[PDB]
Amino acid sequence: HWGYGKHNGPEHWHKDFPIAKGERQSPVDIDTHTAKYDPSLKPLSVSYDQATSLRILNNGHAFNVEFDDSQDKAVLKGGPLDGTYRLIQFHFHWGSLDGQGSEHTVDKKKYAAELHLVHWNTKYGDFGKAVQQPDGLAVLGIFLKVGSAKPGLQKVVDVLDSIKTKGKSADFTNFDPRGLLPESLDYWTYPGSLTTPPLLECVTWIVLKEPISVSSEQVLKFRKLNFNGEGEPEELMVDNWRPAQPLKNRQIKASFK
Ligand SMILES: [Zn+2]
């Protein structure tokens, strides 16, 4: 099955998922000088006051913090979006060392990690229908750099030892994703895809300009996770990022100058 090794990593995915070589694949390099400032872009509306986290899952490629998406309780709107998108889960991508890990890059710079808050368009009723539509998902992408600790991340870090291996989950209630946001909501946006199989071309990407700072100790705990299941040969969950894909016939727009 697909993964992030020599034998099954991103450069192999096209064999099972031919859309990997499609016209709107993610992630991409954000060339900051080429991105067009678009004064028509609205401020992002992130409304997470009523978010209900339920559970955290090691799915063998990342860990997902899952939310109750049975009502409009944690929603993204505004920005480049028309309508309302409900938060279903967040997860991260990260590296074996601090010099790589992000999926998007900024003028070819790689960050230590990247957070993806995944939301689906309520006009399609459920996530599985949304991913079949070109405007089905909105993913908020946030870069992580290593420096000061992110206090709001620590609850996530300190549950990872309970979900070390693929298929483990743990109760994860009352977690407030507002604690993972940077101060500014300035953003880049472009049309793209999920960055994991099935690589569906259903995403409006919203990538924040300002990274959050996490500590080296926080990121080191991410790197103690395992891709493998319980008892299997240990293969650390590191370098679970897809590299930048061709931009093709797309424009990246900036909300800011
Ligand atoms: Zn992701």
Evaluated on CA atoms 206, 209, 210, 216, the torsion sign reads positive
Q: What is the resolution of this structure in A?
A: 1.3
- The three-point CA angle 148-154-155 to 5° equals 165
Residue 2 maps to a domain: no
Verify whether residue 14 is a known catalytic residue: no
- Fill in the amino acid letter for 64: N
CB 50 within 8 A of CB 73: yes
- Is 195 annotated to bind a ligand? Reply is yes
Q: How many CB atoms lie within 10 A of CB 244?
A: 18
CA–centroid distance for 219 within its chain: 16
Which method was used?
X-ray
CB 53 within 8 A of CB 87: no
Tokens, residue 3? 């993964």
Residue 4 maps to a domain: no
- Rg of the Cα trace of the chain? 17
Residue 3 maps to a domain: no
In CATH, what number is assigned to the domain containing residue 175? 3.10.200.10
Q: Strand pairing partners for 189? A: 206, 253
CA of 194 to the centre of ligand 1 (A): 7
Cα(145)–Cα(110) distance, integer angstroms:
9
Residue 43 maps to a domain: yes
- Is 91 annotated to bind a ligand? Reply is yes
CA of 138 to the centre of ligand 1 (A): 12
Burial class (CB in 10 A: 0-12, 13-18, 19+), 170: middle
Which range marks the domain in which residue 81 is found?
Answer: 10-254
CA of 37 to the centre of ligand 1 (A): 25
Residue 1 maps to a domain: no
- In a 13 Å sphere around the CA of 202, the CA atoms on its Cβ side amount to 21
- Is 1 annotated to bind a ligand? Reply is no
Beta strand pairing call for 85-94 and 169-171: unpaired
- The three-point CA angle 119-107-221 to 5° equals 55
Q: Which residues contact 223 (CB under 8 A, 6 or more apart)?
A: 94, 96, 236, 237, 238
Q: Which residues contact 39 (CB under 8 A, 6 or more apart)?
A: none
Residue 223 maps to a domain: yes
**Number of domain units in the chain:** 1
Residue 127 maps to a domain: yes
Active-site choice (12, 33, 61, 104): 61
CB 248 within 8 A of CB 24: yes
Residue 136 maps to a domain: yes
CA of 40 to the centre of ligand 1 (A): 27
Measured in residues, the chain has a length of 257
The position carrying tokens 């099954």 is 8
Q: How many CB atoms lie within 10 A of CB 210?
A: 13
Cα(4)–Cα(237) distance, integer angstroms:
9
- Fill in the amino acid letter for 15: K
